[model samples]
Target chain A: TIHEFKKSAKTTLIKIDPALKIKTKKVNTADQCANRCTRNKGLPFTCKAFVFDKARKQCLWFPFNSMSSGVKKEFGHEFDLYENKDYIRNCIIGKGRSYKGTVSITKSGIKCQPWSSMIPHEHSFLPSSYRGKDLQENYCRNPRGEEGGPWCFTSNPEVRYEVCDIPQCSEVE
Target chain B: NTIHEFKKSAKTTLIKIDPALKIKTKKVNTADQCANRCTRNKGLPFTCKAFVFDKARKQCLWFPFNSMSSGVKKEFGHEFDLYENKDYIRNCIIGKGRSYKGTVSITKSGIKCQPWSSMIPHEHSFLPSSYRGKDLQENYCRNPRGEEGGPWCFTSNPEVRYEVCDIPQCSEV
Candidate 1:
């Protein structure tokens, strides 16, 4: 049903490259389309993203995404894009200096305090201090390439900030 | 072909954590990705012989040596599931041969190795649980206590108490 997959707003579809094929099928629902895609039952190519036309109940399975040069966002109410979260939400890269992951916890299983709130633990690491750090949520951050790559202020008053247990992004070169 | 197969170790965690990043970690969505990276010999700084996938966190912890190594201990944890690369799990020796997971059951002279669980031929204190998580099953030659000479097992022959198996040095493979 693609329940675990991520969903986002609409986008207009166009085939700039002929090789960038879109397998079209009139499905009963998006779930019907997504289940087959997840099962991956030997299609010519793998589906990374899919567009479901709500009005027509037509599914368009795609191998390309918005960043595929040929495609761009021009929101159409009829089309909604669904992406496989595995590709987008992944481990950090390099020292995870600019990591934007959603891992919001400490290594020893402590909930991270909100970046805006100074409730359990308080420090100078506000969103304003490091504007580009994406310090919006209580998610793990390596704003300054801190001693430990990814860490967050813990809700546990005893420990100020603790390192997270997130995995590294091993460069596969 | 068999060298590429991975040995699964459930609820097993290697005890090599320290002040720094002693356990190499990466955030992966699935355990298969962890297996791929570990075996790919990608851009890792050290040789990855074994790895633990933390199910709850979707984290991969890579290790140059497994719990079978001299100082490394195997801790039991519900979240962790370990896997050892099969390249090192061949009939040979690596380092002190502490982390050898090969199935060379016979000694240098083709003598059947005795199981650590049995006290038949010769036994003092090397019980199955007593000597760590040694696979003291079916007379498989093993280095239970990190022997300097390499993988040796208690002999099935009553005359000889124990003997080192004829394991060769690791090759370029």
Candidate 2:
């Protein structure tokens, strides 16, 4: 399911990091940007917010939203910003298989192997095989809802995989 | 065939039935409907551990005992299968932790949390009745009133009436 986004008209982008600028592409409509963002298409980090430039028909995807420390907003009549509601998917409810957070460490304090690379372990888990799993850069994930909770291939050649230390959400009432 | 949809933020697993155990049973048209009622927790005043669907009779059997529950047992059965809620197996916090029901009873300082129903070393108005429907059992940390500091419980230490746990925020990982 798609999340609701807060739309800001006449707003453009400002990079918190001097070297980091917005990633852009030419598109016909803002809806295309929305679809890609919702699906987490071809992006390294989770798509948080985006700017659609009406003047150039350009779509700018951002990993940071206005709520994030780095990104800021500026005036631009030709652009509009759309931010994801659950851009920061904080907390896990169950096994955290759908956990989209950026946890890259294991429960034993080991760094996770990059999903794109199969160095220590060479199993069937691949980013291309599982779409929308956000298999990126050593981030711990349970894309297959494994019983071990959120886990990843360990960078250590001796260890095949390790369960992550991702916390679970507990409902009281 | 339509896929079964569990709770939007729930982790669940399947297990064989333990016919020796007693449970609450209800008639339903489909297993999905049973899953809906269990996940939504409609009309249920308390959280349940697992539910069994009788494919033959179209019945939903709810059990408080799960795979991890004390004295829980299992047996193979073709008439029905059980789905266990995995939310209770881990430790974490969610948004403001207003609905936290985990068993983490420790403060950031490593002090155990005081029970909401107990007037032991500390006393307060966080009575279970005061915050109706909030789980006040044991020493579990909770955010009954949606405090700014997130899930905090009355501390067992008389000097510290209440304190927050050091659980990680999975929202942004």
Candidate 3:
């Protein structure tokens, strides 16, 4: 389940791992910070974690999870962390191999459009060495109109990937 | 200019880096995004070899010199995920650009091919038990000398034969 935005006491800041930080923004409220860190629709990248400094009215965006284990925490004195639990739930915990779902996504450079309207599912890998970040059900189709590659579900259940395919360089002429 | 794609990892797993090799850390939206940043980052004295992304907290840990197997370790949990630079992987393969030594089904037209390495003699029937046409000659294999493509033999002679053909590289479109 996704965790709603909440407030924590002041005089405490979220300690961030330098390598995990992406970008930061200036906002008036923690809500805005959480909102920016929750979606990827219009953003260049997906925002998974964030820290909002209440006193400074600033939002710090992170690309990885801040509450994750193994990260060292220290006194920040003013920052509070906000995470998108929905992504955590659907993409993190819900991700797996051969998921029986309704979504499809292919790799970067392939023309596999989905025939049917579908949704994004989870992040998965190709069965072979042409491995990388692939969609669970990208819903792509080949030039011959056959379903192509893998895909996954998105935050919006109504929309799914269409016409996705993997790049098989060896088979090409 | 990214040298590789995002290879998915299962669950909350991390490639353990020796603390001494840890070069830098940051917060990012996804592990994939973190990987790109790691590849482009030049401030570090050493090249970033591998990274671990915490899904729940949105953290990225960049390693200067290490791999999943090389002095590095694998740690698992329900919060983070790890990804490595494809170039750093010792036996890394890009596309299907590797040596081939196995039985491969012929094209729609049962045409046997020579090994990518050498154009040595191979024993096989041009006609499948099912049947086919004339054994023509064309450059149908990749050039071992790094040229775009080269020639090979397609003989019905049932003996050591050769031909001039050109097969595109796995990277060619």
Which ranges of candidate 2 are over 4 A from the true structure? A1-173, B1-91
The models' CA-based lDDT, in order, is 0.67, 0.65, 0.40
* Deviation in Å, model 3, residue A103 alpha carbon: 36
Judged by DockQ cut-offs, is candidate 1 incorrect, acceptable, medium or high?
A: incorrect
Instruction: Estimate candidate 2's alpha-carbon lDDT, on a 0 to 1 scale.
Output: 0.65
Report the interface RMSD that candidate 1 achieves against the true structure, in angstroms.
17.6
Q: List model 2 lDDT by residue over B67-163, tens digit each.
A: 5454554555676665644433333455677765555556655566787889988878888887865667567677888877977788777888888
Clashing pairs in 1: A167-B26, A167-B27, A168-B25, A168-B26, A168-B27
Which 10-residue window in model 3 chain B sums to the lowest lDDT?
B100-109
Best by lDDT: 1
- Candidate 3: tens digits of C-alpha lDDT, residues B103-142: 1112112234453323345543432222211112131222
Question: What value does the lDDT take at residue A99 in candidate 2?
Answer: 74
Contacts from the true interface found in each model, as a fraction, amount to: 0.00, 0.03, 0.02
Order of quality (TM-score): 1, 2, 3
List runs of model 3 lying over 4 Å from the truth: A1-173, B1-4, B12-17, B92-173
lDDT of 1 by residue, B33-100 (tens): 78887755344554566888899999988876655454677889999988876433433455556755
